[PDB]
A paper describes a structure:
To gain better structural insight into the interaction between CapRelSJ46 and Gp54Bas11, we first solved a crystal structure of Gp54Bas11 to 2.3 Å resolution. This structure showed a small, six-stranded β-barrel with one prominent loop between β-strands β1 and β2; β-barrels with this topology are very rare in nature. The closest structural homologues of Gp54Bas11 are five-stranded β-barrel SH3 domains (DALI z-score of 3.8), with a 310 α-helix replacing the additional β-strand. Thus, the structure of Gp54Bas11 is significantly distinct from the AlphaFold-predicted structure of MCP from SECΦ27, with root mean square deviation (r.m.s.d.) greater than 14 Å. By contrast, A7 is disordered in the complex but is part of the β-barrel core in unbound Gp54Bas11. The A7V substitution may have stabilized the unbound β-barrel, which would also have prevented activation by preventing the unfolding of Gp54Bas11. We verified that the G24D variant was still properly folded because it had a circular dichroism spectrum comparable to the wild-type protein.
Numbering used by the authors: 3 to 66
Write the structure that this text describes.
């Protein structure tokens, strides 16, 4: 119900230091969020291995 994902693309408009390329993020599959920078971000599934922030599609995470 939880998966570890790697940030592979990040929106350049994001604050420097948030969703750095290469870090491991944990995604809660039931509620479809990821925990990062003390916040709960909404994520959506693009493919079985690729995920993006629900609103910011240009920040993409890859299942590890």
């Amino acid at each position: 119900d939880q998966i570890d994902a790697k940030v592979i693309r990040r929106n350049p408009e994001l604050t420097p230091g948030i969703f750095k390329k290469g870090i491991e993020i944990t995604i809660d599959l039931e509620e479809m969020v990821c925990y990062h920078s003390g916040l709960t971000w909404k994520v959506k599934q693009l493919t079985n291995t690729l995920w993006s922030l629900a609103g910011d599609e240009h920040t993409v995470m890859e299942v590890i």
